[PDB]
Design a protein around this ligand. Structure first.
Ligand SMILES: [Zn+2]
Ligand SMILES: [Zn+2]
Ligand SMILES: [Zn+2]
Ligand SMILES: [Zn+2]
Lengths: 527, 141, 287, 279, 277, 133
């Protein structure tokens, strides 16, 4: 709910990665395997190659039943870890003849996932049992139902009675800049913030000594201060955050005060499309471990170097309200490998989405595409609605063409001919034509267009005559006249006349596309 | 320039009278011709202040089409003779400019006395404002 | 703290535009051929009207100035005028300076008291209203939009015009260069029915708060009401139909026991003339 | 299988599509008003024997929608292109024509537009002395011009006309939950008959919240809890509509809650036959 | 328990254009998410009839100590200066920052003439509302004028003017076009036949105040003047809901105004109800 | 800065024409009553234009008493296209030159523009006479 602004979401997204490693590293030790046996692990989805003994399958049922019964009490069925295995032969890895054995062996395994995601909690046996316990209540932050007395006061106010597992995630929400990794150790230890399904994770701070038998180390591959006896498990994570005047993670209400133009919170959530069809192209464990790692390091490592402001030779020029600052105010909440969710200053998230897509299109050799669903929400907005609307603006830009960006909430006719979210290349020429003639940069307008900000609202009123009646040509002369009276007959030559090429293609008229390119120019001024 | 005023007018005048009724085509044609109407009125002066009495006469009963009356007899009488009074008061070099603007509206007014009142006069009044609007865009007012 | 309710003195009357009246608002809304300076007209009838903001604003701005001049002696009559000095805050960008005109709207300075306790005693903002961070004294008068009288509706039915197009020109002193323009203004002599409701909240101070409304009106008859104004375009004159008290016992029961004052053929200066104790004498019996 | 469909034509905007247990608590609180106290416990014994209702589902101008079964997911590859295998699985509702096809495991089609639109309206809270704002958000289901919501009934008609058809006239004037003092849950009622063909087999999709006694075959789980007379109900593990049981009658759990009467929670299944794949 | 439901219908006539807004033209009115017709919320009309009836009682917290109990436990005024719930003063519920009159329990809310009708939460009690203020949408005459090319909203640009230098600082406000018709519906619930009478007298008293005041929006700049035209009074008895056989008490108020309905017709039109209760 | 108010000196009277008058080929008339009438702008814009010409010759006698007459030399900006310079008529309206002091404190010191009012860029000093029809 409307608590825990962005120190808390950023704590959850790394808490999920701890549970993702607390199971994989549990499988490796219990079966006698090293970290080479992990094929990949990114975004709540892993794959381990192991042996086929009768002894190991006894162990893998113990791992699974102990993970799920932890994930039922600690989270009231909101999260589920569906673990499936399938025995293969040796010849099943490489291709035989012309038939990909490794793909159909992966389809035998992915279907056992799909059945297990249906039987969502089968290995519980107290799942559908009913026992009425006296006087439970629910948490104000996360909404988990606990018995009374377990709800303890928070770290913000002693008035509210939050979960015990939230106060560990607000305290972790401050220890994120003061952090150099995690240490995996036993449950009944001192100094552990958060517990996983098999172990406990101690923070290894800035100034401190690592404790535990295995040490997760974020974003670096070199054992700097690590003892000789310990195991070095490197995990990468997209970790950019704008620091406040203190030594800490930014707020919702800091990012939007320091934005361009008016104040608003710019959420984007985009993901790679047709990626599950892409990993079936691979036909050996040498080939799939590579393709799931180069795809892994884009949203893990190379998205940090984009936000730091690099690679102008690769990217070029983006639709940008102002040139990129030295220390940008961007908070990477989550970025998984197929997916990302980035908040920030709402006119730099607008600039970043065309800067992520441009660098992704050269990281891949022009073969895979993104679908970014941009939203713009106020600071006083609960996050569970911001993720709800933006993910629906995502599936708006997903089901249409899978290579297209949503930019602004925009009104459309009820015919079906008019699809909302902009194609990537189609939009970035609408910025090249419309924006440098009505906008100059840094939140101000062109010459002699000031004291005519009423005009661009009137020009977006004539777009609202196209929506009640698409068949009318009332918008053609009203476009020409309003540019005439104001003396601005030179601007918008594409809008003053009808396009006979656009009628026969059954595509929208050029007054339909002008809504999103005008609003970004208009909202960047104080409007 | 003026060489466009000689060719495009004589291309359009035979298309003008052959569609004398105001209910010619509600499609893209009457807006495509209306730009060509102001295209050979561009090279002429075509001052609007003498037309302001006619357009306000079109304005004051445009509300009266809209649940005011169901009779546009008394209005459209006043539009016919005043538009003849336009050359009937103003002559000179502005007369040769205003003769070519006379020959488009006078076929359409005579429809409107016996026309429908909710219909076929809206189809005129939409062709009214298409002539004015582009005329501001080519450089006249 | 302590908002009460005792009734609503309703001032019914007719605004008579002695000179051409001009307000003006937006033009070209899905429309091409106009005079490009149209008085605001409501869309359902297409007739002009006097708004409430154009009358409450001009009754306010003629009553900041009266207070701004007599700021020195009214600190005893009204507290919280000791926070102020005569002048503007314009020379130094402060939302609370020593002077009177304290609040920046966009680029102009309009007196609005910052708190509920400060505006409760201020003569301006206790009547016309106020605002602030978290304190926010709301108004007492409801100035409603004025429309044409039963008579002048029919002069739009009979065929008489209601708007006139006046041509004014500008002239160079040297070359006599004519620089013309056109205005749409209300025809001189048209007549709008206004209504100003006064929400009586405290029976301690309504006599000195109705007198302030009839002071801002009696200045408006000598000043202009919107528009170009300094060149004749205002000159408005209040013709009072009826004062009515509308008491508290009226709203529950429904009995026609509302106290009606006698304002048949009286000027706005004649109500505030010696006789304000006699026109509103029977209001004292109800308190 | 001729079902007495009950159409609920909305006036104001609903707080939610009513769950099956939102309805039965609304109906029981109606019969405690228009029939006294003893008829409600008599109503509870009638649903124990034979009578069943379903959850509410939307309709858009006679085009009656129904929940998609979970029978189609384990062998959607045996049905039919990868883009089609996802957009068919992502859906939540199927049309009355297309719900019958997926019971027999035929290829089918999703609807194109959903009737309702969950919009969030901002409201405000104003103090009476200083007119000072205090905003809070609020969100509710907003239905279209023709569209609305319906649900089903199958059972003895002397239990229908004796109990439900009075209750759906009392519940047309006090809402089905939500802020029904802002005119939210109100509607007008018309009853109809509706026919769904079920293939005879021992597996069955449930058109209401299942709350099973034995573990089902394939189930989309759901956690919700109600509010009886200001008392919170505990969260219960219902199953969402469209899950597959074999020969399971469901149940109702009475709850204590510290009220004068006992409080039942409707979780009786609503079985319609289905053909399952191998697993 | 339950006895019947006095359903009030009629028409709301927004004589002067009114504005509500969504905070997203700078201040747009609320509309439907699909059709685009503006409307009046049920909350903007329940709460507005609550504020106007709250203040009237606030003046009469002394004189109504014999007609209503649980006003002896109140003194007039707010509780903003000391952030102290259920103190001696009247408006004793701080929602976020606004201090509103809400009674805290049941047996004081049953006697308090606001919380009995409009309803009050409090702690441990939750006495629900008794009225149901259903939304108001434009009359089918005005739904058709929406289809007849007429604009149902219009922008008014107001300005803010410097006192000395007379600069101009405009702003826009999208209002509903003046002269419109909304059809409303207010559905009272007859829970107790003892104070059956006063809730219809105390609801129509709040409409006598709403007709003189404004209905949301700028209001004091002129954007209210809502006017109530009644069309039907009903009763919908407990006999009606059991069987559906149409024998409900109907009172005719087809040309009756809201001050001609309180006492001019209140003994008259609700004479037929009093025998049935 | 500091707009105040002490009163309003009212100058009533009657304009008489001993010789025949014209305004503007009809003389414009009051529409509701039919009668001709002398407007407001033809009587305030005529007195200003017979006072900006009178001040133009005398910029040595009034400059000791009025400040912001030293900021102009007696002249015209009609040949030289400059907005605010030494010449006395400074505003090009569209094509005409009317003396308007471009600030509050210039018009507070000006003898013309403290009386017949003055526009400006963010100054906009307002008039002190209002001339009715
Ligand atoms: Zn919690
Ligand atoms: Zn003040
Ligand atoms: Zn109360
Ligand atoms: Zn000067």
């Amino acid at each position: 709910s409307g608590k825990g602004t962005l120190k808390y979401l950023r704590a959850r997204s790394a808490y999920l990665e701890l549970i993702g490693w607390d199971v994989v590293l549990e499988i490796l030790s219990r079966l006698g395997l090293t970290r080479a046996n992990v094929v990949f692990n990114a975004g709540g989805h892993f794959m381990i190659i192991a042996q086929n003994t009768p002894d190991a399958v006894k162990e893998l049922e113990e791992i699974r039943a102990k993970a799920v019964e932890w994930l039922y009490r600690e989270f009231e069925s909101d999260l589920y870890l569906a673990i499936e295995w399938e025995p293969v032969s040796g010849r099943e890895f490489g291709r035989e003849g012309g038939k990909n054995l490794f793909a159909e062996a992966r389809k035998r395994l992915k279907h056992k996932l799909t059945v297990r995601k249906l039987k969502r909690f089968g290995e519980i046996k107290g799942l559908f049992e009913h026992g009425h316990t006296e006087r439970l209540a629910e948490c104000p932050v996360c909404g988990r139902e606990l018995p009374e007395g377990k709800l303890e006061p928070s770290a913000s106010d002693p008035e509210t009675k939050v979960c015990p597992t939230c106060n560990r995630l607000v305290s972790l929400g401050g220890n994120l800049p003061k952090l150099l990794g995690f240490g995996r150790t036993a449950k009944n230890d001192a100094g552990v913030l958060v517990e996983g399904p098999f172990s406990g994770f101690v923070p290894y701070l800035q100034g401190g000594r690592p404790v535990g038998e295995q040490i997760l180390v974020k974003n670096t591959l070199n054992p700097g201060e690590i003892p000789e006896s310990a195991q070095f498990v490197p995990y990468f994570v997209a970790d950019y955050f704008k620091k406040d005047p203190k030594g800490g993670v930014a707020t919702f209400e800091e990012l939007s005060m320091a934005s361009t133009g008016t104040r608003r919170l710019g959420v984007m959530k985009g993901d790679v499309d047709r990626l599950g069809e892409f990993f079936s192209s691979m036909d050996s464990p040498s080939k799939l471990a590579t393709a799931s790692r180069f795809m892994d390091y884009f949203f893990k490592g190379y998205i940090g170097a984009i936000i730091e402001g690099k690679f102008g030779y690769i990217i070029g020029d983006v639709p940008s309200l102002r040139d990129w600052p030295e220390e940008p105010d961007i908070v990477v909440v989550y970025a998984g490998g197929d997916d990302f969710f980035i908040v920030g200053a709402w006119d730099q998230i607008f600039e970043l989405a065309f800067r992520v897509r441009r660098a992704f299109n050269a990281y891949t050799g022009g073969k895979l595409t993104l679908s970014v669903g941009l939203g713009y929400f106020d600071e006083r907005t609960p996050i569970y609605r911001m993720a709800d609307v933006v993910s629906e603006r995502l599936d708006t830009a997903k089901d249409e063409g899978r290579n297209r960006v949503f930019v602004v909430g925009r009104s459309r006719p009820l015919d079906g001919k008019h699809k909302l979210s902009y194609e990537w290349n189609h939009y970035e020429e609408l910025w090249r034509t419309y924006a440098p003639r009505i906008y100059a940069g840094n939140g101000r307008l062109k010459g002699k267009l000031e004291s005519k900000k009423g005009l661009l609202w009137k020009l977006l009123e004539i777009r609202e005559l196209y929506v009640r009646d698409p068949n009318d040509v009332r918008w053609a002369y009203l476009t020409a006249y309003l540019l005439g009276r104001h003396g601005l007959s030179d601007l918008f030559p594409e809008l003053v006349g009808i396009d006979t090429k656009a009628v026969e293609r059954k595509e929208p008229q050029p007054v339909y596309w002008v809504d999103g390119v005008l609003k970004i120019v208009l909202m960047a001024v104080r409007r | 320039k003026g060489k466009q005023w000689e060719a495009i007018q004589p291309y359009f005048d035979n298309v003008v009278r052959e569609a004398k009724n105001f209910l010619e085509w509600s499609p893209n044609k009457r807006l495509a011709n209306a730009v060509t109407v102001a295209a050979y009125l561009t090279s002429q002066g075509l001052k609007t202040n003498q037309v302001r009495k006619i357009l306000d006469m079109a304005r004051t009963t445009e509300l009266k089409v809209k649940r005011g009356e169901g009779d546009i007899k008394d209005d459209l009488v006043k539009m016919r003779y005043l538009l003849a009074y336009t050359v009937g008061k103003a002559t000179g070099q502005s007369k040769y400019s205003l003769d070519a603007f006379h020959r488009i509206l006078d076929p359409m007014l005579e429809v409107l006395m016996g026309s429908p009142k909710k219909e076929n006069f809206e189809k005129f009044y939409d062709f009214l404002q298409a002539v004015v609007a582009y005329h501001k865009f080519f450089g006249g007012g | 703290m302590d908002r009460r309710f005792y009734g609503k003195i309703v001032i019914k009357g007719k605004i008579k535009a002695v000179t051409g009246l001009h307000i003006g608002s937006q033009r070209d809304i899905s429309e091409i051929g106009g005079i490009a300076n149209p008085v605001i007209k409501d869309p359902h009838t297409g007739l002009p009207y006097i708004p409430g903001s154009s009358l409450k604003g001009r009754l306010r701005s003629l009553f900041e100035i009266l207070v701004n001049s007599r700021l020195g002696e009214w600190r005893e009559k009204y507290p919280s005028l000791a926070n102020y000095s005569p002048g503007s805050c314009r020379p130094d960008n402060q939302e609370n300076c020593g002077k009177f005109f304290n609040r920046k709207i966009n680029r102009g300075w309009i007196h609005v008291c910052p708190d509920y306790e400060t505006a409760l005693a201020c003569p301006v903002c206790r009547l016309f209203g106020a605002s602030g961070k978290e304190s926010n004294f709301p108004s007492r008068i409801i100035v409603r939009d004025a429309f044409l009288t039963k008579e002048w509706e029919e002069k739009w039915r009979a065929g008489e015009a209601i708007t006139e197009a006046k041509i004014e020109v500008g002239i160079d002193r040297v070359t006599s260069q004519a620089n013309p323009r056109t205005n749409e203004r209300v025809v001189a002599g048209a007549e709008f029915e206004f209504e100003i409701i006064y929400n009586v909240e405290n029976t301690t101070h309504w006599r000195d708060d109705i007198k302030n409304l009839l002071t801002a009106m009696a200045l408006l008859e000598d000043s202009y009401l919107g528009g170009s104004g300094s060149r004749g375009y205002g000159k408005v004159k209040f013709i009072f139909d009826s004062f009515e008290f509308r008491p508290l016992d009226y709203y529950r029961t429904g009995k026609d026991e509302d106290i009606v004052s006698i304002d048949a053929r009286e000027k706005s200066v004649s109500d505030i003339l010696s006789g304000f104790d006699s026109l509103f004498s029977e209001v004292e019996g109800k308190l | 299988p001729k079902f007495i469909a009950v159409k609920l034509i909305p006036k104001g905007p609903f707080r939610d599509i009513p769950r099956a247990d939102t309805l039965f608590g609304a109906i029981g609180n109606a019969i405690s008003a228009i029939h006294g106290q003893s008829a409600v416990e008599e109503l509870v014994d009638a649903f124990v024997g034979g009578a069943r209702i379903s959850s509410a589902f939307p309709y858009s101008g006679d085009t009656y929608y129904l929940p998609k079964p979970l029978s189609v997911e384990p062998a959607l590859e045996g049905i039919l292109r990868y883009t089609t295998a996802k957009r068919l699985r992502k859906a939540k509702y199927l049309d009355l024509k297309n719900f019958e096809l997926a019971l027999r495991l035929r290829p089918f089609t999703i609807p194109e537009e959903i009737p309702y639109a969950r919009v969030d309206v901002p409201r405000v809270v104003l103090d009476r002395v200083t007119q000072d704002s205090s905003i809070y958000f609020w969100e509710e289901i907003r239905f279209r011009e023709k569209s609305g919501v319906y649900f089903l009934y199958s059972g003895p008609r002397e239990v229908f006309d004796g109990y439900i058809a009075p209750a759906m006239r009392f519940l047309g004037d006090t809402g089905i939950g939500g802020k029904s003092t802002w005119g939210a849950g109100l509607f007008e009622v018309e009853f109809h008959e509706m026919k769904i063909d079920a293939p005879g087999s021992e597996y069955s999709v449930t058109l209401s919240n299942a709350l099973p006694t034995k573990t089902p075959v394939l189930w989309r789980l759901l956690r919700k809890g109600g509010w009886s007379f200001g008392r919170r109900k505990p969260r219960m593990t219902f199953i969402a509509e469209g899950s597959i049981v074999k020969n399971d009658p469901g149940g109702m759990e009475r709850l204590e809650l510290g009220l004068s009467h006992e409080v039942y929670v409707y979780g009786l299944t609503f079985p319609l036959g289905v053909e399952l794949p191998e697993g």
